[PDB]
Amino acid sequence: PNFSGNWKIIRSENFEELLKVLGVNVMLRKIAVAAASKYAVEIKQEGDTFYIKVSTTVYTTEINFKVGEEFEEQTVDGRPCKSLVKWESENKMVCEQKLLKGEGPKTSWTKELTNDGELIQTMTADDVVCTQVFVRE
Numbered sequence: 001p002n003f004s005g006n007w008k009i010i011r012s013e014n015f016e017e018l019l020k021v022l023g024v025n026v027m028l029r030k031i032a033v034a035a036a037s038k039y040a041v042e043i044k045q046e047g048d049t050f051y052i053k054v055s056t057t058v059y060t061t062e063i064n065f066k067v068g069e070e071f072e073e074q075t076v077d078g079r080p081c082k083s084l085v086k087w088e089s090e091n092k093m094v095c096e097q098k099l100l101k102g103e104g105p106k107t108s109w110t111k112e113l114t115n116d117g118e119l120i121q122t123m124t125a126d127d128v129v130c131t132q133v134f135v136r137e
């Protein structure tokens with residue numbers, strides 16, 4: 001697998017519903033859905049080490065981790081969490097998140113390279129799965 005590349009979103013499903021579970025009110029959810037349509041992921045992968053830059057028009061953030069080594073990031077709604085990435089197969093990884101503070105819905109994300117040159121990312125909050133599909137820029 002090489003996830004490395006500059007990825008451009010082509011499809012985004014169930015994102016508003018994810019944010020609803022997470023407690024975001026509707027006007028902000030619609031504004032977030034719009035931001036998600038102009039959103040890009042840059043990945044540099046070296047073996048089991050990943051550098052990931054996620055950016056929208058006005059915001060950019062970096063996630064760096066090594067598979068199997070716990071790290072700190074934030075949930076989709078910005079709450080700090082403890083995260084651990086494991087492989088599920090050659091081209092799919094799964095991340096479990098644990099809130100650093102307080103309580104909230106159970107959240108996780110996945111990344112998968114398809115055999116057709118697509119990157120599929122999912123994000124989960126309890127019962128709700130948002131799916132996002134990217135192609136290489």
Ligand SMILES: *C/C=C(C)/C=C/C=C(C)/C=C/C1=C(C)CCCC1(C)C
Binds near residue numbers: 033052054056
């Ligand atoms: C491996 C990829 C990861 C962990 C992706 C994380 C993506 C986000 C935290 C996305 C957040 C977004 C918003 C909260 C509002 C709309 C734009 C997004 C999709 C960039």
